[PDB]
Design a protein around this ligand. Sequence first.
Ligand SMILES: CNc1nc2c(CCNCC3CCCCC3)c3nc(N)[nH]c(=O)c3cc2[nH]1
Ligand SMILES: CNc1nc2c(CCNCC3CCCCC3)c3nc(N)[nH]c(=O)c3cc2[nH]1
Ligand SMILES: [Zn+2]
Ligand SMILES: [Zn+2]
Lengths: 356, 356
Amino acid sequence: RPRFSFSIAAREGKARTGTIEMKRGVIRTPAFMPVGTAATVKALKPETVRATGADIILGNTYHLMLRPGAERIAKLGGLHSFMGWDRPILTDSGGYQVMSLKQSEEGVTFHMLSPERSIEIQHLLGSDIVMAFDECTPYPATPSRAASSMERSMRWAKRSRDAFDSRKEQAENAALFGIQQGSVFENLRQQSADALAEIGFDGYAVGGLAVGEGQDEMFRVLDFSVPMLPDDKPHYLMGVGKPDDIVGAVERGIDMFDCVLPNGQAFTWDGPINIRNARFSEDLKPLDSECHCAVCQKWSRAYIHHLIRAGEILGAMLMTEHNIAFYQQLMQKIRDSISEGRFSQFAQDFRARYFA
Amino acid sequence: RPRFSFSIAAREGKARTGTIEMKRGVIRTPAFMPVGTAATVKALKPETVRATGADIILGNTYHLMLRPGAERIAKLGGLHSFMGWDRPILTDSGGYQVMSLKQSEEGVTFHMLSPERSIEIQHLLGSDIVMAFDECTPYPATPSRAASSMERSMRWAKRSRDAFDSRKEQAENAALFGIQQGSVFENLRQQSADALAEIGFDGYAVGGLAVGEGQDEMFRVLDFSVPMLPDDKPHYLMGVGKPDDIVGAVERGIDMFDCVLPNGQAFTWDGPINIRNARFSEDLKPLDSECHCAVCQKWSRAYIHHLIRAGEILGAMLMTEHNIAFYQQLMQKIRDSISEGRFSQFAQDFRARYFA
Ligand SMILES: CNc1nc2c(CCNCC3CCCCC3)c3nc(N)[nH]c(=O)c3cc2[nH]1
Ligand SMILES: CNc1nc2c(CCNCC3CCCCC3)c3nc(N)[nH]c(=O)c3cc2[nH]1
Ligand SMILES: [Zn+2]
Ligand SMILES: [Zn+2]
């Protein structure tokens, strides 16, 4: 395989379906990327993650630089070897989680992160898709503050790019994505998009959303922001999100998603359910009537209700496998409907039923 | 298969290896029976339990009568269907755990358990191997108190037997084991053994041990107690135990074991290790050099050390799979060495290395 190749197989409106080819594997797009806690996808063996249909997962840079340490993981052979996932890994750059838990143009101490260190840590982990080091601008933000933050991020983006390119092995085997900022302001989004295209990246993320503004406002910003990005590269909406968020974002040109979202909340095609609710204590149906996951093949709502109420580890295991598989099934239905030119109908159908 | 058939294939001294045939499957003896928490074997799918080599597991009567309720599980199709294990299940009778957390000849309230209710609960759960309702006598015990307790248990044993026999479906499809009591006193053990043989059971457990007396005293009591039981039926040592305990007990005629034993303790053929210890932070070897389990095929000590320190669910999953597989491998080596008439040599070899 090549280091990085994104190809678009089919389109419908702003929506696209295609593939990202990387040395460690292929990523079908639009993609959902399950997120790790600490060199693990919570309560799942990698084989199980893969069985749900995931093509790529997210590494947790912020936690790993802290424990076990990026340098220790590198010594040990890299994240892939360490956790036993041999497919692509995306790593965020760490500042989002820092501010989420001393800032300056050099970076952030909390103990220290700058564009250079962030890129180096992601290299030590052996990430396939490296995110630029950015500032995720708080919401709401005044235009002055948003512009100031955006500008710093773009400077940081240039520094990320140079750092990455400076390291031969990283540059030859990994990909680098830039992250657009600008809060909810179109001119700032445009300035950010332009800055990033000028530097040039393998992919473009839309940063600073999913931070309290709500779906209506997120969709509004996506409406003008995603077309600002290079059409011919992947578009990643960081931190999104619920099923309905994903569908709308794909309608607006987004190709990649991560969220910690997929406790007793189970996703179903009739909307989410909380399996702790007493109404499931004797319900012998699976979590969802149509889901093809192994959980839904073998265990009832009543059983999983018991496990979660009882605080049992198997309950977390089963709920997590189901929910990550539900997300992959969602993505698969999205990919298929776009390929077949019936994605707008799928979205309408999905929403009618999910919100009935 | 028959309801119950125990056959002894080979012997060496007091040790035996054979099979228990039951309608839901065959149990190779000497057997290790992994214990459930709340209709689950902690952090393991049933397929995984089976993959480690387990032939039978233990249901947790005390927890299940409380949550979810025996009646609810029956309504839902029984424990087997509920948790997704289709092989034999052994259920203890509940009083051990009660006293472990108002006693009278009728039973115990805590809310209520008697021989009749205990047998009924185990039936509602759909247990294959039903334990008599007994009193586990505290240690140390004066001879008066031990005798009094033992006597009650034997009365309770007769009541268990009648209750079981009174229920056609239970009697035709399940097995009933009596439990010997008598603390550490030989005459009491003998009186208990005689009482139980007179009633007649499918199997005989040695109760009241592993309750603080220590291995030397446990082995001493087993030395005279196990030969008191019918030779031609299985002998079950309740609550034991560590690997070395198991080996010694098999040398003394025990065929069946359960313990909650198989936190960061990992069993190895060179003895146990605590994987949380700093010396494993960068150790790339598997938990054990020879173990054939999937964990040891794929992940390092360093990784599992990280997971456990980090409090990650995958760490519990992996440690539990390894430890239950280690126990099954121990049992398999025991079974093979007895079949081949080299079990005393295996025991000496095992101990020399495990305690080096
Ligand atoms: C939930 N909302 C949201 N997330 C954003 C994220 C994080 C995406 N999730 C990454 C994983 C989180 C769990 C641990 C492993 C990494 C953002 N990240 C960056 N760098 N920049 C953002 O603007 C940015 C904006 C974000 N908005
Ligand atoms: C650990 N020591 C020990 N255990 C004994 C047990 C319990 C065996 N373990 C059963 C499982 C425990 C975890 C939950 C599921 C049931 C004993 N049980 C009974 N009825 N009688 C005993 O004398 C008896 C004596 C015991 N000594
Ligand atoms: Zn499912
Ligand atoms: Zn192992």
